[model samples]
Target: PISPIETVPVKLKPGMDGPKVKQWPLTEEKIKALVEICTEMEKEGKISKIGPENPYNTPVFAIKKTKWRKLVDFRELNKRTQDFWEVQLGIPHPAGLKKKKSVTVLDVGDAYFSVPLDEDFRKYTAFTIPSINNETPGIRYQYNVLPQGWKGSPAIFQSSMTKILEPFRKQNPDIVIYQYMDDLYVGSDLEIGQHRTKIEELRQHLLRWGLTTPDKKHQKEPPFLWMGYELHPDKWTVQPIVLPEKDSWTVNDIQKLVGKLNWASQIYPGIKVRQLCKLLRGTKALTEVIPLTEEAELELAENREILKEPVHGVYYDPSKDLIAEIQKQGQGQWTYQIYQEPFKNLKTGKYARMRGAHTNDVKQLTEAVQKITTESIVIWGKTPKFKLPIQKETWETWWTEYWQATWIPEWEFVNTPPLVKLWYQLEKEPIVGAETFYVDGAANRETKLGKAGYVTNRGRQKVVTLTDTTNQKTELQAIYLALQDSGLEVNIVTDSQYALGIIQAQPDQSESELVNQIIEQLIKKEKVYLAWVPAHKGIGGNEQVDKLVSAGI
Candidate 1:
């Protein structure tokens, strides 16, 4: 059943015109799909023909997932429209569903169109399409129902859905109903018969409000796809749906791909693909083709594989013991994968040594995972027993015979006292008669190479190749490398405050082994000092370092 007409007339800002945009250039296949999309929408009475001289008209383009969808790029209209954005934010997850005995999902078909639009405001969402006759002018159309791309659609639809379910929720307080946009999850901790009864009651109640639940989409059991994740009885998994092959792509394609992977990242939060998603930068048109570099193409493939590779988390079990294992991998970058016993292949990421990573990152991350539950489960590993720069020792008579990756069953932190900070001169320039080196950092994110470099007063230069690390780490590496060949009374300068903070950090505060190394190296020299310099402020040494770091692949 289709929802009734909306009461509130959509308010539009003055001087907003939709006719400013022309129809996007479409391929032959896309034009055919466009015809089909118009046919379908018209058949459903979601849209109707309008005169070409309408006051407002936005551009519309076709995008295909399973079906061809006319995505109206309602940019200016959206900007001009007034809406108070509010939504029901809570949704069901494994932790909240711990005792739920029965669960099911309700997927609404053609959700946005189900809500009829206010007739007086229909012209605001009008759009143009290329005329079939090459010798003629374009055809115009406007939505009779609420459009999908409008900013307020979700909030509107969610409110409407919520209003429809309010009475049902009020009566059956024991059942859990989680509605997010067009999807609904019905969960219950009650006995099987009672849950089944309430599920039918809710379904009937939805029908009474003119919303239909499509068959096969009313997922009744586990191993079902909900909100982009596949939920099994004991575990959850996410895999981006396979994309069709294409040699070149528009910005929308890249965004659609990224959006799917991002939804998948709801499980693996470390999937930081910002470096890879830079292909859509600038004023390119929606249907305009983006020139893809080899690096960009490779990154897309890697992201697809990363999202496709594995299943995610196990349910939180209070009784079972959790075991974890972390180890080193990768060059010039820190790497580790963690497994929590039954929750296999869970977390994967890397942090550069420039941050307080020994991986000081590993223990902090592991402890964070452990802190997710204070269920009194034993952790099977020790956190660092040594402070920043110190290495452990067994001095007496260490034998050279045996070495292996062994598992230990307990964890502890070192009780080292905080070290004093002595290196802050607070001046931008070096002390009198001292050799100084200035360092800085950024690089090619697409090609996976990071540049960090330094230059001395004598025009001498140095550079290091860093893999899979950030610009901050690159800055710290530059300083660390700069200190290798200089005077006892040397001054090191950097433009990054974060990098400087790492070197000046006390034993308890610092987690970086690299920071530890920097401090230890400085402590050996009698008159070594560090200072912060403003970037590109006509500073001689800093300029050369900046110029040197600009060279990238």
Candidate 2:
């Protein structure tokens, strides 16, 4: 009932010219289906845009299949003569009499892990992309290193999970059963009883279906890995944790941390430990540098040993032989015109390391940052100013001040990322057209009541109200003020007949001075689209808004 309708075009022969030809041939069965559904929707008036001729009309678009052919036309016989794919319908309203009842199931979840580590998680790996090259002898390089063990693994696991969840989904058709890899998160938003009662019903449902929630394991919110992210359902707090403390150390107190710090060199055979060590070098001069290779890892570990009390050790590498010769020749002397040069630059003073931190810890921080950071990127340019590491005294002082300040509480978690991700990935996504939103205010001066509301494809039933003395122009002024505060593209919609007429009419030079000033102020604040929604013809969202307006009155 809340989707779009699609139309497909049919190819026309060169000289074909008729209205019937444009309509094309529709199968009797399909045509019957389309007409029946459209007729019902037409009767209901749920369509977004209605035609001028008919009040309840739904607008439709048609395209010539011939022009569609040009876009796909090719000269080669194999390509040109190939059969075309059909894209018949676009209307997305559910075609049935049955209604989907909302359900609110318990969201039982846990964290989990990925097989291989991500480059982003590793230190010194955030180097700039390589330069472009087109020569035949040039090296094959990628834009950035992809995280290992991340080869569409989530999809595979999610597929298996869906199979496991098939029966539950089939039995409860209306249920919004969602799972994010192995970290199970089940929820629905319908039940007549309290939240606790609803949760109990879901718990019994899962039990009857022979499925168990994470609570069955006696863990409220344990540290688990889901889609390579360490889940910490704990508070959003930033803690200082570093990987690989010293640049060229073979081994130093990794065991000091409580959680697991997976050491790759120890896990795998022939892993160059020194290369891993390379990440720790030149801390005083530079904090970050180029990513280490296998040889570089071992080279770094050896350097740490050389910096030890005895201070005498050789870094075993093939390049070590050439470096010794260069040192013997005293900087400039070399047998050949070109001397042996390190492929990567030696950067200084850019990165630092935190000692004895948990690998699991870094993963947790990353996950939290990813979630919050993504939200920040959507609403703002960068991540929001989240937590501040304040001292106890500073926090106490700030808390006292915050409590005294005139601020009203307002926080709502709309929807989770996994479901949003799945919605987009499945291609059954909603088209969120236009960045424009409408903010309207309805008020009754005598009653001293008012309501502020806005509409967007993503959010509905979003309203704000103040049930106190506010004048008619003041109510209009309140909405204008609210719209200005939102800091987004907005248009103001109102149904006040007299006010709408007053705002639209250009005032005379002497008369209506106050009305003109108010209009000017509204225009100055934001791109205000002042429009009128006719009263009470059951015109879609307007009917709901009419009730809201009446409540204020």
Candidate 3:
């Protein structure tokens, strides 16, 4: 049994108070059934007769599958009504019943009829019955109770039902009861005697409210099929029963199949109905018949059998996994930089192809950075482009200037810096022969020469940089050189943050073709680590490298 909370105000279109629409024909039996229901509603004060001035004339239909049930179409009125609020019954699955031996399913027939509408909005449900030549004259009737398809009936009904069942729900925690619209399923794991007591209490409550479930719709025991899914109390499982079809399917057929799969998803948890809908979208038109491909047929078959398998855990949409991961990781300080390919063309400017890489790839990387960093800083090299289907002004602007400037936050907002005794740590961890390496790069402006050097087991060796580049480019070259000559794992000590950032990130089309190629090989072929040390630190190796570069200058 349910009761309305309060009358809800309805919002209507201008000059639409008693809008009239063309009436549709109905069978004689349907007309009689409709008249009978209308008469009962009038006596119950749920409906009232209106004069010829009542202009609202809506179409009505006899529910083909139901017994003498008439449905009045309120689609037009629904469009004008504002959805102020709604409530859910918070239904639970059969598994929540705790292996109940006995079950009771109840239906509060014509549930929406109990929800009384406000005096002002009742006129929207007004409909006219044109008179038959010798039969009853035409009359207009308006409903006081919430009407079907009125847009607000479900919310009103659910709120009322929840209030009526609150006390029972609290006292008998072991009993599981769930309601969808008017249908209610009640059960418990208790013995038949105990179950009957609870059932009697429910019936008594309904009686007090002048509501009763029809005998045919009430079931005392046995597995119950609620909605379109089967609920097995014995096994504590809800299973979907749907047959897969192999032949071509119409749009309606596919739509129905999609709906069945959606219901199945509730039971199986693993079935992805949303993804399956993508396959249907391939048909393009609702009237367009399409044959199910081999893969699609196989997928449908697998989904049908999914309920037979054991349930693991609840389902989580994978699309939101990334967002969940971000919240899980405490937003901590981190760095992000775009490393591009084919180093900026220094001289002829011919090498600056400005090739855009995959925008999706960039988005994925950006998402990763957001999840991984809190006070994240992004510094880009020559603002890389993105591979897009068509050039968009917004995207182009982003590629041009996004991350061009460094993130320089106030000192107070900055995270506590790592207090490392760099000199002492380096002393403790002395560089080994081939496993460890130190690199330095210098650009002699006068000579137009860039020199790079790496210290290895064989002592210092000259490293080659791409011709006509800056000190930063030379630094990158030296690191790449060490990576080429090292083993599975190599430690590289450097003083250039630019080179360090580029090496750490996966290569894009911003660096030179040579730099990108070497980095690519370095990533797959070696586990390279970079350690930074301040320049002019009076370190012997660093001093020697400086002298070597100054000699070239």
In terms of lDDT, the best-performing candidate is: 1
Better of 1 and 2 by lDDT: 1
Error of 1 at 35 (Å): 8.4
Instruction: Give the alpha carbon lDDT tens digit for every residue of 1-553 in model 2.
Output: 1111111122223443211111223334433444444344335432122222321111122234433110101122112122333322221111100122232323333211112112222211111111123122211111011122322224333443455457657765655454533444433445534433544555665444333453434533323333323223221111222335544323223222111112221111111222333444453323223444666545445434423322111111222211100000111111101011342111000111222121111122223334434433432233333221122343343334331232111222222221111000101121233233343457676777777555533354455666674545444543445444444334445556655554443221112344445544554543445556665566545566556545636
Q: Compute the lDDT for candidate 2.
A: 0.32
For each candidate, C-alpha RMSD in Å?
13.4, 32.2, 17.0
lDDT of 1 by residue, 1-553 (tens): 4676344466666665444666765666666887778877888888898886786768777787887766778887788877655665344554323336677777887788787776777888777677554346666778887787787677778778877888888898877777777888777777777776777778777777667884444455678776566777666666446655677788788777767655555455344345346677775887887887776677566656666556476544334344433232222222233344533533333432333342232333333334332221322222311112111221111112112122223433332222111332233355788777888886576866788888888667888888987777788788878777776677888899887765543222255666767666666665656888898787877877887887874
Candidate 3 per-residue lDDT, tens place, 5-106, comes to 556666776654544776665667767777887787788877899976666778776665666676777877776766556465244433223334677878
Clashes of each: 3, 37, 11
Q: Candidate 1: minimum summed lDDT over ten consecutive residues — where? A: 389-398
Q: Candidate 3's C-alpha lDDT?
A: 0.55
Task: List runs of model 2 lying over 4 Å from the truth.
Answer: 1-178, 186-197, 207-210, 214-217, 222-234, 237-247, 250-553
Give the Cα error of residue 224 in candidate 2, in Å: 6.8
Predictions ranked by TM-score, top down? 3, 1, 2
